[PDB]
Amino acid sequence: GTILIDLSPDDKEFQSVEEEMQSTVREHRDGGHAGGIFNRYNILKIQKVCNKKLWERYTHRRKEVSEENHNHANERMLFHGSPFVNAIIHKGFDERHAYIGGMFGAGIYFAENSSKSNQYVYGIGGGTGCPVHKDRSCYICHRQLLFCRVTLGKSFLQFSAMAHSPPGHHSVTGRPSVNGLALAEYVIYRGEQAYPEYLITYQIMRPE
């Protein structure tokens, strides 16, 4: 039941999503190994993901979490990169979309930095790169990321360099404790706590 609606580049909604994508690029400690070498993107398309059943699943869980946390869902808009982007937009997030070996346990991981999520587009560690050229820094092939509505509720704070949430919590927050420029990363342990609201198609751009 998913339909994708193209946003016009003239639409304020396109423009605000693009700005969040571009403005949250950073350099990575791997020198570009996983995600490629770039400072910015060429945004090719932004689509709204519309699915009534998946939305209702999200808002149902959101209300449950809100009621467990003094009427505060603690909702964020966060990036998600995954080889399973097509399955997610049609079927919703679930246990098959978890990062089993993640540092905060087996859960579904999201990032404030779009460039962190870009590292996962072709798999963990960038896998073998793009299917066509086997290049993790491919400047030709089209990539996709999701910009997602995520319910954090009461989040367990981990200071740092599917499973269950820690008791009495609805998510985990990975706070960077070494790299002063890194933004936070987040993990949820229930697929119903995220909705894949925007599908963004893009290329990474070669620095000049």
Ligand X SMILES: COc1ccc(-c2nc3ccccc3c(=O)[nH]2)cc1
Q: Which of 63, 72, 90, 133 binds Zn ion (CB under 5 A)?
A: 133
- Which lies closer to Zn ion via its Cβ, residue 74 or residue 203? 203
* Residue 82, binding choice from ligand X, Zn ion, none, Cβ under 5 to 8 Å by partner class: ligand X
Q: Which of 28, 61, 62, 80 binds ligand X (CB under 6 A)?
A: 80
Q: Which stretch binds Zn ion (CB under 5 A): 32-40, 50-58, 67-75, 124-132?
A: 124-132
Number of residues written out for the chain: 208
Q: Which of 87, 124, 183, 205 binds ligand X (CB under 6 A)?
A: 124
- Residues binding ligand X: what is the number (CB under 6 A)? 13
Q: Convert the chain into a string of H (helix), E (strand) and C (coil).
A: CCEEEECCCCCHHHHHHHHHHHHCCCCCCCCCCCCCCCCCEEEEEEEEEECHHHHHHHHHHHHHHHHCCCCCCCEEEEEECCCCHHHHHHHCCCHHHCECCCCCCCEEEEECCHHHHHCCCCCHHHCCCCCCCCCCCCCCCCEEEEEEEEECCCEEEEEECCCCCCCCCCEEEEEECCCCCCCCEEEECCHHHEEEEEEEEEEECCCC
Q: Which of 47, 51, 82, 173 binds ligand X (CB under 6 A)?
A: 82
* Residue 80, binding choice from ligand X, Zn ion, none, Cβ under 5 to 8 Å by partner class: ligand X
Enumerate residues 158-187 that contact ligand X by CB under 6 A.
Answer: 185
The CA distance from 136 to 121, in Å, is 10
Nearest CA to 43 out of 93, 6, 89 is that of: 6
- Which lies closer to ligand X via its Cβ, residue 61 or residue 116? 116
**Interaction between residue 121 and Zn ion (CB under 5 A):** no
- Residues binding Zn ion: what is the number (CB under 5 A)? 6
Flag whether 97 is marked binding: no
**Interaction between residue 77 and ligand X (CB under 6 A):** no
* Residue 133, binding choice from Zn ion, ligand X, none, Cβ under 5 to 8 Å by partner class: Zn ion
Task: List residues near ligand X by CB under 6 A.
Answer: 79-82, 99, 109-111, 116-117, 120, 124, 185
